Amino acid sequence: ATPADWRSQSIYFLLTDRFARTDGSTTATCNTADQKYCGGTWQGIIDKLDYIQGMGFTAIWITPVTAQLPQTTAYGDAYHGYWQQDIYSLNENYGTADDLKALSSALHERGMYLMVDVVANHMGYDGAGSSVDYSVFKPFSSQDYFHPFCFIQNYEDQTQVEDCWLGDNTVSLPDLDTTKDVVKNEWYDWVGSLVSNYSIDGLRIDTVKHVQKDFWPGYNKAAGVYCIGEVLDGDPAYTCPYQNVMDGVLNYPIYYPLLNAFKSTSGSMDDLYNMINTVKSDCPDSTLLGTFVENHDNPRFASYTNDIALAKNVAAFIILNDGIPIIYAGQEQHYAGGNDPANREATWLSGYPTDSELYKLIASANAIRNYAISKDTGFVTYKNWPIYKDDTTIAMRKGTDGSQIVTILSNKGASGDSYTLSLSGAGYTAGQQLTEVIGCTTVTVGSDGNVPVPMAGGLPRVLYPTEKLAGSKICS
Ligand SMILES: *[C@@H]1O[C@H](CO)[C@@H](O[C@@H]2O[C@H](CO)[C@@H](O)[C@H](O)[C@H]2NC(C)=O)[C@H](O)[C@H]1NC(C)=O
Ligand SMILES: [Ca+2]
């Protein structure tokens, strides 16, 4: 629940309404285009925690918990949790306060954390902004508590972005005036109680760039746990400084060159390579960020390409990069939905197979990461070091000398040729035996210290000293 506690964590992000139904149906329709509640619940999550923990995740992030606008708007229901209007009540679509507290408990019984998604920027309302009935907003019952109505029109104008409203006149998002101490006192008091009541281990904080910076430190304090913010901008100059104000932020700077590097057989390794060092240098701490290539606000990775080799490579990058890996429910079943609402597919419709190609991959990656962290107290703080690149290849190093994991990633795709990469800079000793932990082969370092890395089928390669795996179950 502390920021240091979270560096070791590996997060599985899910939409409560779309992950698992109480009845456990794997056939119950959920048409993303309809934009309606499909019936996923907190209890549904509890009943599938074997499937989340089996990928070696240690934590889940759920969408917001507060009671939503009730209407079916022109844009559908508030299944997603981001249109709240009664913050001291729960959205009853997902279950009881008992059900929520019981989720936080099936998790803790499992040595797992609970992260909860929280909105402080705004409420939701059905209809135009000029028609908002603020008396519905518990406990922000008057227009005094809110910014004057306006739409955000130029994101370059950071003073709009914080003061004007998100959304449109079809679903408007009344923007709490987070400047005035009535709001600050209320939110801060709210969040600590939220955390206390449900035993929340950490918070993911929505739309952070839309609230002024000096609001957040008191919020992070008040919450009393690790907070990671959604600052949706690809520029490290813009997004990293928000770490000056809260523990982490989602690693959107990495997001874009990460996607482009692997979304086709000719993506730029250079851009990815350079952004890794950029974030290493310039963000306050790259090891407290969240790494992702899929979420609910962007087309899924597979919507760019169904090549499983490329999908394997990106999922590996996410687990083994600096910071906290964040896989989006569905990604492990190779979901291909496009932009919102097409990326909100129900997870149960996949049938939850634990032998799908990406679930075995993500499990192997989490497994070696969790095990390395077991044996190396420096692993989570040793900053990911990009040791090599070429046109189709990036290779990176993380871990204390003698225990480092060295990851070779490729974008040759699933029809790649078979050849041998001579990898310098990995730092191992001549003749040292290395286990490639995805495919469970061995590689030996050899006389000059370069590693002869077999390259086939566009597959990721994840190397770890074989002698250090004496205990584990990793390739046995
Ligand atoms: C956590 O639970 C407690 C009660 O179990 C909530 O306390 C209420 O808070 C409101 C503040 O708006 C008070 O006016 C009520 O009198 C309180 N009730 C009781 C029984 O003490 C607390 O707000 C809950 N926190 C959240 C975030 O829901
Ligand atoms: Ca705002």
Author numbering: 1 to 476
Publication passage describing the model:
In the process, two crystal forms not currently in the PDB for the proteins α-amylase and avidin were discovered.
An innovative protein crystallization screen formulation called FUSION has been developed to help with the production of useful crystals. The concept behind the formulation of FUSION was to combine the most efficient components from the three MORPHEUS screens into a single screen using a systematic approach. The efficiency of FUSION is demonstrated by obtaining high yields of diffraction-quality crystals for seven different test proteins.
